[PDB]
């Protein structure tokens, strides 16, 4: 199973229809300086390492 | 939620206006000074005022502030 | 000619603490002026008297409850003394609100 290990540079807002998600711009561990925004479920700070299968897909502010 | 109230801030401002000298940056001395000069019917309130004055002093080192 | 040591307890009970404290201080000062061996203004577990009640006269609202409390201050002042000196002391040494009480004898 191919896994792409993400890493936080900045938190780009708490979101969701309710509150259980967070827009986060990420520079993943290997092959750095590529910024992709992903929505994250749990509590996240700065330099947090994130486990994900599907890397190169962007999700917006949820309705 | 530790936003200092109007009253405390006002008092601090007044103190700074009237006694800009004798406010030696650090808390402890400043607190005592506040207790001496300003008449506060409390202790906690006085402390708060002292803290705010110290903050103001710190600010006023790094430029001029409005009011 | 007398001077026979009895050892006398003084009770100081009240509510308004400041007054009580003042009285205690006064007593100690008086003891000092008559110069006697004495144990201090010994303080006991300041008994609170709690009465908790429905705030509602009639039981039709939310269940609001109030604890009406009575702070009490019990003080022992022990004297190594005869009785005459104690009597002399207790001629004055009375201030409003505070209870002055002499237990007398060891």
């Amino acid at each position: 199973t191919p896994v792409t290990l993400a890493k936080v540079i900045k938190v780009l807002g708490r979101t969701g229809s309710r509150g259980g998600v967070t827009q986060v711009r990420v520079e993943f561990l290997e092959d750095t300086t590529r910024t992709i925004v992903r929505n994250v479920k749990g509590p996240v700070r700065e330099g947090d390492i994130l486990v994900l299968m599907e890397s190169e897909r962007e999700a917006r502010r949820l309705r | 939620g530790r936003v200092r109230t109007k009253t405390v801030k006002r008092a601090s401002k007044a103190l700074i206006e009237k006694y800009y000298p004798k406010l030696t940056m650090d808390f402890q001395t400043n607190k005592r000074l506040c207790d001496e000069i300003a008449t506060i019917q409390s202790k906690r309130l006085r402390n708060k005022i002292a803290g705010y004055t110290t903050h103001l002093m710190k600010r006023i080192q790094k430029g001029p502030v409005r009011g | 000619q007398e001077v026979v040591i009895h050892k006398i307890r003084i009770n100081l009970t009240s509510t308004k603490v400041k007054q009580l404290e003042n009285v205690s201080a006064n007593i100690i000062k008086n003891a000092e002026t008559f110069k006697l061996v004495k144990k201090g203004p010994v303080r006991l577990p300041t008994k609170v008297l709690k009465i908790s009640t429905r705030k509602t006269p009639n039981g039709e609202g939310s269940k609001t409850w109030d604890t009406y409390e009575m702070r009490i201050h019990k003080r022992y002042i022990d004297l190594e003394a005869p009785a005459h000196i104690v009597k002399r002391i207790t001629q004055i040494t009375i201030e409003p609100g505070v209870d002055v009480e002499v237990i007398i004898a060891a």
Binding site: - | - | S62, K63, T64, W65
Partner: protein, 141 residues
């Protein structure tokens, strides 16, 4: 005449007076020694401060604890706290201060309270609630 301190240990309502004198190496709690205690699992907790600085700092200092308040767990914790304090106090008083500082460092890098006393006490269980916050049951039915 002996070099000795009287230390307190404090958690919840448990209080523990450990007396730190000088002698062979006796560490007792309520007459019985340091070994027993008997929540059984929490035994190793009381062993922790001792372990941290070693058995060497006990062949000189004797510790004797009297514990009131609390329950079992709390009592254990209080004892632990007391023991931690006692050694430190002794070092501060009679032994060199470098040793004391080292002890402090060891404790602070492993701060399971100890030299810092426990903070929390219960909120008062106010009216309209079976617990402190926890209310009864509103029933708009």
């Amino acid at each position: 005449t002996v070099p000795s301190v009287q230390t307190f240990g404090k958690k919840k309502s448990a209080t523990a007076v450990a007396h730190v004198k000088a002698g062979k190496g006796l560490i007792k709690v309520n007459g019985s020694p340091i070994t027993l205690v008997q929540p059984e699992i929490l035994r190793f907790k009381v062993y922790e401060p001792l372990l941290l600085v070693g058995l060497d700092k006990f062949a000189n200092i004797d510790i004797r604890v009297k514990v009131t308040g609390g329950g079992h767990v709390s009592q254990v914790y209080a004892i632990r706290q007391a023991i931690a304090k006692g050694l430190v106090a002794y070092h501060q008083k009679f032994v060199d201060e470098q040793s004391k500082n080292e002890l402090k460092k060891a404790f602070t890098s492993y701060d399971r309270t100890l030299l810092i006393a426990d903070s929390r006490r219960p909120e008062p269980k106010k009216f309209g609630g079976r617990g402190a916050r926890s209310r009864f049951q509103k029933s708009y039915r």
